[PDB]
Design a protein around this ligand. Structure first.
Ligand SMILES: CCCCCCCCCCCCCCCCCC(=O)OC[C@H](COP(=O)([O-])OCC(O)COP(=O)([O-])OC[C@@H](COC(=O)CCCCCCCCCCCCCCCCC)OC(=O)CCCCCCCCCCCCCCCCC)OC(=O)CCCCCCCCCCCCCCCCC
Ligand SMILES: CCCCCCCCCCCCCCCCCC(=O)OC[C@H](COP(=O)([O-])OCC(O)COP(=O)([O-])OC[C@@H](COC(=O)CCCCCCCCCCCCCCCCC)OC(=O)CCCCCCCCCCCCCCCCC)OC(=O)CCCCCCCCCCCCCCCCC
Ligand SMILES: CCCCCCCCCCCCCCCCCC(=O)OC[C@H](COP(=O)([O-])OCC[N+](C)(C)C)OC(=O)CCCCCCCCCCCCCCCCC
Ligand SMILES: CCCCCCCCCCCCCCCCCC(=O)OC[C@H](COP(=O)(O)OCCN)OC(=O)CCCCCCCCCCCCCCCCC
Ligand SMILES: CCCCCCCCCCCCCCCCCC(=O)OC[C@H](COP(=O)(O)OCCN)OC(=O)CCCCCCCCCCCCCCCCC
Ligand SMILES: CCCCCCCCCCCCCCCCCC(=O)OC[C@H](COP(=O)(O)OCCN)OC(=O)CCCCCCCCCCCCCCCCC
Ligand SMILES: CCCCCCCCCCCCCCCCCC(=O)OC[C@H](COP(=O)(O)OCCN)OC(=O)CCCCCCCCCCCCCCCCC
Lengths: 606, 106, 178, 169, 459
């Protein structure tokens, strides 16, 4: 009981230690990125210890480490609900972040603020662990906005870039709408159950939770970039590649999905919530796969891959399968960490060049990165017995075998086929064909700081799904008695997508121009949602603000109503009352009128 | 068309001054004027493990055992799984076994 | 960047700009090098076919129709170089392009950390002191009495003289400052 | 320092280890190393601290207030006994707040202890919580920010009058 | 309370008898000691109220305001040290005397046990703010701004005086605890409705309520830094304290006379957040942010939930600290560039990294970052407002969204982006102003660490 809590809070202490070293004025004498990388790997080992303990005895833990404040009949206490989800995501996130910071030490070389970057990544990791392991909604909300703000800073890392600042601002906006949904849910639970404690939420499982479930759904939509609130993720690709990987690929984007997994006992009792979660997830994975089919920037392609897999998780949470969603969280975290790290190595070797139209012959010129990229693409598509086979295939069988929306099922299968097709597009236009990059060869991937995190993430993306899924305690009973076309559905549609995209890429190789069609224009131009919404909603908002609020109300009509009207009235009265001609004749006539008036009031008063 | 002679001469003079400025941006070899390794397993990682882990582990263990277990409901854990045929360590009673399992086709 | 835009773009300049934009969008569509070379040779053949026009009103109409076709058949995501506006590395290092006048505000200890570079810095400052009045006189002398003037600037017209307004051009921060 | 009379906890029932496999248990190995490296020096330091405490031991007492006359036997306008009854009421209000906190911690501890059986084995804790929140809603709800003994008495009198009117039929 | 009032009173002979090369040092150090002495009012080991005398008392609500004022006075001297360096010694000592008079009269105002004494000290505090804004303001609109501020506040405060004298004649003593104990219900007649409006509108002007908020932006813009601090951090909260003190004797008709002011506050914080989005002046933008935050305070105080009163208290203290910090950062930029334009200075993250860090933490406190007392105030106000009516969450959500937008718009257009390289008159940093930002931001961290001090009367 002591070693478990000591290990968890030691993970937290080892996370907070490089921040104190950063503010303790000894960075100029030590190697801060290497020190932080060693700190994260040690945090991963002391995180591996309760992973083994929970895999043995399945002990479920609550730790109240610090009583913050007692507020009549409501105690805000800093507490951790050490879950299965909390333990496994802690281990996976620490392993991934160790890989990302080693890759960051390689990639952010010749950068004046490499220590600033490393400290920002560490602070983001601390906030993400707070969000993941938090027991009460206030602490989870602390983690939520800490992650959001550090995402803002890391997107606007290159603060001299107007596009980076704009992308960070709109990421803040969509995360803020998610925060509004979270605040609605938090306030409803505070009013109806006197606490933000998940135990009292579990006791709240047996009533109508429609309003707080709607709030949590809005919060998860904002955080996980589902449809309506999606484009902040592909805009958030603007920042550096390790930020892209760690933030937008593995840890932050699955926070809303993680929140839904946390509130899954409430989710199971509301059928309307389950149906709208399923429909929203199917729509967003279909739309994001459609967008991913025709992008040219490799980071944008794998970002829309991230959003489509998040839509798959959101579908899985539309089903009563939260543990499958969390397994896909860990699986997806591994895949996108390795894929993004490979893409960043490609970009650095090709000198900050990002779109796939100026790449090629990568299999021959960068064999290690090519092999790891092929591993990531195959395992993301769902090659059997890799890490993705133990989550994605079970999701496909679950949606094929349980009662769902038919259109959601169909577009989920088509989205999986599109996942195969854009993975083929990545493989073809990067690792195949002839070179298209500028001639000067500056490729040097022989750095150990580059190779070793990709090796660790390759071992993850090969074996971690198998090891984890065989170590999961049995829950959410799958169905295995099912027809052969339903059983091999995911593999069949993945092979079909690979073949279709291969022949389409060969048709692009064929020497003929074709007139573009509105389907490809819709897919390449982001579905027109960013252009249309980001032009009409800010214009109406700021136009209403300036034209009505400030100008009309404050600078015109409240001034015309109270103060200038009072001043004008008193000015008119004082001019009218002291426009005196200065004649004693008129003054004495006025005095006579006053005398007559006072006699009249005396006569009427008596 | 091409360069007019005035702007051509201006760019040549400006570029020559740019060459001079960029050459003057160089650093002399004395600038800036500033005012037990063993093996990695035995000193690089061992000292880190015994310094930045062991003392924090001591402090956390002290705080956990002497400021959380002394309080009632700080560390609350679920009941462990109890199976038939198991022996309870704390109580000492053995759980009776299951029924006869009529289906053994697989 | 190093030359100021004129009052208007001529027809020949507009034709060249349309040709370059059309070939860039053609490479964005074609991707493969042999395919782009084939279709770019076709586009060059089209431009050479419409090259010899004398009426010039028919040429303006042809230019309008050609750029209308270009706007109909332009790539939704044309290829942009990373340093180009709208690219990925555009304005990435403006956060590192620190202007040179902060060395005037540097502490004497930080100045003593780099003695020779700072000594060259006051040599450059003294040269600027000596050249400013002469280049102001040159700018006042070479200004035309008419209201016509462009944004172009004169060069130095004699020995021992510097081009007018040379400081912000010569002492600009590097595009790779670190 | 805490007592099971006010923080009830069922006795733990852990099963004996029955390792079918022949592989060593890394949790047991790391736990034994963890005690031998960490727990022994920590308990040595705490024993030194505790014997220093025993060398310099001091005592403190829990303050108790006698019952002043309640606001019902208290004349209006006579602000002395108004004040005494009002601060007694505020003290009892704070005590009831902490009683609510105690019951809420009991409910949370029950839910975390039972885990998957919380819908059945936490019936007594949920019943106690429901009864105490019904009593709290009867005595302190909807008083406002300027809650007082007079407002609580008015609300109680209104509730009693409503109950008496409903008890006629 | 006398042990805090008397040495603050004796600060004035120290100011007028100190050497011209020692006046700032002596007054700043001794006012820091005044704040340290004023920290003793937090010794509340009992539910009983600290009634020091028949005239002065301390309260769980009055104590944080007194400590805040005593803390801002040395910070006020620090901010006023720079723009008076080219100024006469007699006028410097006069300005220090005006600030010390503010600090003294505000401690007596918050610690007064009598509402008529509270009113006397209310516009006794109004006078030196007028003098500071009118004499040491920079632009030509300072005279108009002083006229607007004074006459909004006095046309508010006259019916408050009539209502106070009527309450004194009706009850007998107007003592706060006697009123709180022998509070009598109102008959919900027209006379009682007009009396309620008379005793409410003064504090509603001082808040300021939406529609009558027009004196605040121009006074904050044309005011000096110490005037901006005293207004945005003490005087609005003084109107807050006035409503909290006066609302006890207004039952039951406040439950329906609260209706227009709640709507005005919610729609007005939305309106002023929109103005913050489309505002071209930094001081104006911070002023309208202050108007929105005090509109939240109005909504909480008028819905009269205990959770709402607590959220109003924590929002009082948190918004005072973060608004003073925001005005300090704006004034540092103003003393750098001699301009107040929002868009003119852009890339200050490059030249001033530590000041941009202070900018970032100030804006994060402004936009309610967890677990700060700012967000605790807004979240508990949100909870109480949703309890009052479930459809308030839409207006709260719009307000919070636009709040995040204007805070990040501040950060992006004042720190991020390319540097305006033509501003060669950018001195690196003063240790004085960096110390000013640190002394503004550290108490926010400490009150975040321990939020039980500023919970207020209800809990
Ligand atoms: C549970 C968790 C609850 C909280 C959750 C919070 C979630 C959200 C976090 C958002 C963070 C936003 C952000 O990016 O902030 C950057 C911000 C600093 O920005 P920066 O870019 O590093 O600024 C440096 C300059 O740009 C350039 O300067 P430099 O590069 O030379 O840096 C040198 C370094 C040097 O650092 C210092 O000199 C440290 C200054 C404080 C020293 C205190 C000594 C006390 C000794 C007592 C004995 O300076 C700094 O790091 C910043 C200086 C100012 C920091 C002030 C922080 C509060 C101090 C409070 C003191 C209270 C004392 C009470 C008595 O970070 C902080 O303020 C601290 C880290 C974040 C918070 C703490 C860690 C998480 C919570 C742990 C509990
Ligand atoms: C082989 C070697 C093995 C060594 C083992 C360890 C031995 C050892 O050191 O034993 C501790 C040893 C004896 O232990 P003990 O007597 O059993 O402990 C009784 C407590 O000290 C009794 O308490 P105390 O009041 O006497 O002293 C503790 C006190 C000390 O405090 C002070 O001294 C006041 C501050 C002074 C500042 C000066 C500058 O701390 C507090 O009152 C609380 C400190 C909390 C700090 C962290 C705050 C986190 C805020 C989070 C905000 C966000 C919350 C979000 C919530 C979300 C969910 C709602 O010495 C101490 O306890 C002294 C600790 C001094 C700490 C200094 C740094 C913090 C200040
Ligand atoms: C800043 C806001 C300015 C505008 C609003 C001003 C306040 C509006 C509400 C209060 C009424 C006016 C002030 C009266 C103060 C005393 C109230 C009181 O005691 O009420 C109970 C009393 C009644 O006392 P009573 O309770 O004893 O009633 C008798 C009851 N029996 C018989 C049963 C015992 O109400 C009044 O006497 C009110 C009469 C007011 C008449 C004069 C009003 C003049 C104009 C005022 C506003 C001027 C400034 C703004 C002009 C426009 C600017 C754009
Ligand atoms: C089957 C069911 C389907 C259901 C579908 C439901 C869809 C719901 C959609 C809800 C959200 C819609 C509004 C989103 C607005 C986003 C605005 C934004 O951030 O735009 C960014 C834009 C510039 O960015 P961009 O154009 O993308 O990139 C330029 C790169 N050079 O512009 C900017 O950066 C401008 C900077 C900000 C200006 C101020 C904005 C203030 C907005 C206040 C909004 C208040 C009301 C919010 C209501 C939310 C309701 C959910
Ligand atoms: C939503 C709520 C709605 C309800 C509440 C509404 C009321 C809110 C509070 C009222 C605020 C009023 C503000 C008045 C001052 C602003 C006007 C002003 O500044 O006017 C200046 C002007 C003189 O300007 P001057 O300096 O000469 O020249 C310009 C530059 N040299 O001045 C003039 O020309 C004349 C100024 C006269 C003095 C004005 C201040 C005193 C007003 C007394 C009002 C009495 C009302 C009752 C009268 C009896 C009944 C009819
Ligand atoms: C930053 C992280 C802060 C975590 C919360 C505070 C931890 C320290 C603490 O609780 O100190 C207070 C405790 C005495 O508290 P107590 O006796 O209960 O009475 C309180 C009245 N003063 O004082 C003691 O227990 C004194 C002995 C402390 C020994 C050192 C403990 C260091 C390790 C603490 C790990 C906490 C990790 C929390 C991580 C949260 C997320 C960042
Ligand atoms: C600015 C917006 C103003 C309009 C806001 C929307 C209408 C609000 C109406 C309202 O406040 O109604 C409350 C109350 C309803 O009437 P009732 O509760 O029956 O009172 C019995 C009185 N003999 O109505 C009344 O008691 C009538 C008097 C209400 C006065 C409210 C304040 C008016 C504006 C002051 C500034």
């Amino acid at each position: 009981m002591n070693i478990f809590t000591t290990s968890i809070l030691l993970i937290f202490i080892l996370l907070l230690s490089p921040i104190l070293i950063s503010m303790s004025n000894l960075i100029k004498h030590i190697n801060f990125p290497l020190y932080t990388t060693t700190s994260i790997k040690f945090s991963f080992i002391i995180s591996l210890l309760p992973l083994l303990m929970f895999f043995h005895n399945n002990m479920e833990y609550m730790i109240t480490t610090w009583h913050w404040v007692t507020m009549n009949s409501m105690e805000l206490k800093m507490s951790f609900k050490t879950d299965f989800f909390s333990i496994l995501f802690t281990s996976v996130a620490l392993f991934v972040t160790w890989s990302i910071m080693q890759f960051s030490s390689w990639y952010m070389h010749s950068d004046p603020n490499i220590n600033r970057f490393i400290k920002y990544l560490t602070l983001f990791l601390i906030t993400m662990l707070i969000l993941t392991s938090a027991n009460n909604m206030f602490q989870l909300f602390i983690g939520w906005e800490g992650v959001g703000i550090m995402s803002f800073l890391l997107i606007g890392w290159w603060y001299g870039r107007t596009d980076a600042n704009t992308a960070a601002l709109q990421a803040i906006l969509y995360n803020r709408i998610g925060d509004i949904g979270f605040i609605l849910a938090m306030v409803w639970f505070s009013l109806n159950m006197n606490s933000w404690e998940l135990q009292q939420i579990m006791f709240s499982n047996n009533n109508d939770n429609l309003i707080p479930l709607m709030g949590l759904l809005i919060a998860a939509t904002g955080k996980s970039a589902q449809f309506g609130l999606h484009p902040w993720l592909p805009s958030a690709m603007e920042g550096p590649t390790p930020v892209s990987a760690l933030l937008h690929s593995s840890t932050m984007v699955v926070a809303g999905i993680f929140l839904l997994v946390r509130f899954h006992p409430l989710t199971t009792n509301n059928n309307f919530i389950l149906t709208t979660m399923l429909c929203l997830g199917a729509l967003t994975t279909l739309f994001t796969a459609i967008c991913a089919l025709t992008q040219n920037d490799i980071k944008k392609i794998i970002a829309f891959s991230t959003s489509s897999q998040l839509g798959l998780m959101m579908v899985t949470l539309g089903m009563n399968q939260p543990h499958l969603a969390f397994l896909h969280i860990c699986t997806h975290a591994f895949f996108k960490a390795m894929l993004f790290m490979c893409s960043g190595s490609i970009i650095h070797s090709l000198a900050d060049e990002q779109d796939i139209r100026k790449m090629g012959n990568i299999t021959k010129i960068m064999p290690f990165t090519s092999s790891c990229l092929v591993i990531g693409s195959l395992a993301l598509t769902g090659m059997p017995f890799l890490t993705g086979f133990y989550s994605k295939d079970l999701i496909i069988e679950a949606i094929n075998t349980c009662n769902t929306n038919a259109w959601a099922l169909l577009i989920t299968l088509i989205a999986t086929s599109m996942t195969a097709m854009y993975s083929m597009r990545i493989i073809y236009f990067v690792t195949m064909t002839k070179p298209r990059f500028p001639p000067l060869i500056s490729i040097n991937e022989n750095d150990p700081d580059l190779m070793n995190p990709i090796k660790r993430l390759a071992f993850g993306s090969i074996f971690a799904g198998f090891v984890i899924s065989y170590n999961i305690p049995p829950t959410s009973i799958p169905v295995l008695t099912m027809p052969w076309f339903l059983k091999t559905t995911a593999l069949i549609i993945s092979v079909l997508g690979f073949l279709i995209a291969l022949e389409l890429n060969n048709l692009t190789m064929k020497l003929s121009m074709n007139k573009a069609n509105p389907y490809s224009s819709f897919s390449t131009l982001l579905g027109f949602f960013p252009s249309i919404i980001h032009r009409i909603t800010p214009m109406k908002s700021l136009n209403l603000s300036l034209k009505t609020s400030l100008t009309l109300l404050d600078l015109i009509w409240l001034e015309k109503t109270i103060p200038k009207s009072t001043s004008t009235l008193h000015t008119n009265m004082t001019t009218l009352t002291t426009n005196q001609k200065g004649l004693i004749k008129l003054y004495f006539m006025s005095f006579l009128i006053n005398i007559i008036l006072i006699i009249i009031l005396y006569s009427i008063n008596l | 068309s091409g360069y007019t002679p005035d702007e051509k001469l201006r760019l040549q003079q400006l570029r020559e001054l740019r060459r001079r400025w960029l050459k003057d941006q160089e650093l002399s070899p004395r600038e800036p004027v500033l005012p037990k390794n063993m093996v990695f397993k035995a000193y690089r990682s061992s000292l880190f493990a015994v310094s930045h882990v062991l003392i924090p582990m001591w402090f956390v263990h002290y705080y956990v055992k002497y400021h959380m277990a002394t309080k009632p409901y700080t560390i609350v854990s679920s009941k462990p799984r109890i199976f038939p045929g198991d022996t309870i360590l704390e109580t000492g009673e053995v759980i009776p076994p299951m029924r006869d399992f009529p289906d053994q086709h697989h | 960047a190093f030359c100021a835009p004129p009052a208007y773009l001529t027809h020949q300049q507009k034709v060249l700009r349309l040709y370059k934009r059309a070939l860039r969008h053609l490479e964005s569509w074609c991707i493969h090098r042999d395919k782009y070379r084939y279709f770019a040779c076709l586009m060059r053949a089209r431009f050479e076919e419409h090259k010899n026009e004398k009426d010039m009103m028919r040429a303006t109409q042809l230019l309008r129709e050609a750029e209308e076709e270009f706007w109909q058949n332009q790539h939704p995501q044309p290829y942009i170089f990373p340093d180009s506006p709208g690219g990925t590395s555009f304005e990435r290092y403006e956060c590192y392009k620190v202007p040179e006048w902060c060395l005037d505000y540097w502490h004497p200890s930080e100045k003593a950390m780099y003695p020779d570079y700072f000594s060259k810095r006051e040599q450059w400052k003294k040269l600027r002191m000596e050249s400013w009045d002469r280049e102001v006189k040159q700018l006042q002398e070479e200004t035309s009495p008419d209201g016509i003037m462009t944004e172009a600037l004169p060069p130095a017209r004699r020995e021992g003289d510097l081009p007018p307004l040379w400081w912000h051009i010569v002492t600009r921060p590097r595009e790779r400052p670190t | 320092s805490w007592d099971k009379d006010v923080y009830p906890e069922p006795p733990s029932r852990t099963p004996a280890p029955s390792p079918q496999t022949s592989l060593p248990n890394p949790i047991t190995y790391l736990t034994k190393a963890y005690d031998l490296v960490v727990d022994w020096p920590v308990t040595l330091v705490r024993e030194f601290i505790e014997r220093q405490h025993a060398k310099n031991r001091t005592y403190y007492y829990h303050r108790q207030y006698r019952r002043v006359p309640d606001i019902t036997e208290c004349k209006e306008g006579d602000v002395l006994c108004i004040y005494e009854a009002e601060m007694q009421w505020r003290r009892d209000f704070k005590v009831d707040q902490e009683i609510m906190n105690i019951i809420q911690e009991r409910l949370k501890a029950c839910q975390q202890r039972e885990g998957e059986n919380y819908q059945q084995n936490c019936a007594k804790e949920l019943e106690q919580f429901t009864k105490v929140t019904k009593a709290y809603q009867d005595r302190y709800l909807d008083l406002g920010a300027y809650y007082s003994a007079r407002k609580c008495l008015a609300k109680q009198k209104q509730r009693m009058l409503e109950e008496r009117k409903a008890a006629r039929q | 309370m006398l042990k805090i009032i008397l040495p603050s009173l004796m600060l004035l002979p120290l100011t007028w008898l100190s050497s011209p090369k020692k006046t700032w040092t002596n007054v700043t150090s001794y006012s820091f000691l005044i704040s340290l002495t004023s920290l003793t009012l937090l010794w509340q080991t009992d539910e009983n109220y600290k009634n020091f005398s028949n005239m002065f008392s301390s309260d769980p609500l009055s104590t944080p305001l007194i400590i805040l004022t005593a803390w801002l006075l040395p910070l006020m001297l620090m901010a006023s040290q720079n723009h008076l360096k080219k100024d006469n010694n007699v006028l410097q000592k006069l300005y220090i005397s005006m600030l010390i008079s503010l600090q003294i009269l505000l401690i007596m105002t918050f610690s007064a046990t009598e509402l008529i004494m509270f009113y006397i000290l209310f516009e006794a505090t109004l006078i030196p703010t007028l003098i500071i804004i009118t004499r040491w303001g920079n632009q030509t609109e300072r005279l108009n701004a002083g006229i607007y501020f004074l006459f909004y506040t006095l046309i508010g405060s006259i019916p408050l005086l009539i209502a106070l004298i009527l309450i004194q004649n009706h009850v007998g003593t107007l003592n706060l605890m006697i009123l709180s104990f022998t509070t009598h219900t109102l008959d919900a007649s027209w006379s009682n409705n007009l009396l309620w409006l008379a005793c409410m509108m003064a504090f509603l002007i001082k808040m300021p309520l939406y529609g009558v908020h027009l004196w605040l932006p121009k006074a904050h813009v044309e005011a000096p830094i110490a005037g901006s601090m005293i207004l945005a951090a003490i005087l609005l909260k003084l109107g807050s304290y006035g409503m909290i003190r006066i609302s006890i004797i207004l039952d039951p008709l406040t439950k329906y006379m609260a209706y227009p002011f709640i709507l005005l506050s919610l729609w007005g914080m939305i309106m002023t957040s929109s103005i913050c989005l489309r505002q071209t002046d930094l001081k104006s933008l911070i002023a309208y942010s202050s108007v929105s935050h005090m509109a939240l305070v109005i909504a909480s105080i008028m819905i009269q939930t205990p959770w709402s009163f607590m959220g109003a208290t924590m929002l009082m203290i948190a918004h005072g600290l973060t608004s003073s910090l925001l005005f300090c950062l704006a004034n540092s930029n103003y003393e750098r560039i001699h301009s107040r334009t929002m868009i003119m200075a852009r890339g200050l993250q490059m030249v001033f990294p530590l000041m941009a860090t202070w900018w970032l933490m100030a804006s994060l406190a402004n936009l309610a970052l967890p677990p700060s007392i700012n967000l605790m105030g807004e979240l508990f106000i949100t909870m109480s407002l949703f309890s009052w009516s479930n459809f308030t969450i839409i207006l709260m959500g719009i307000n919070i969204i636009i709040t995040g937008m204007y805070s990040m718009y501040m950060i992006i257009t004042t720190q991020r982006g390319k540097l305006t390289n033509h501003m060669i008159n950018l001195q690196p940093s003063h240790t004085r102003e960096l110390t000013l930002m640190a002394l503004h931001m550290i108490p926010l961290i400490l009150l975040t660490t321990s939020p039980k001090l500023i919970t207020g009367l209800t809990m």
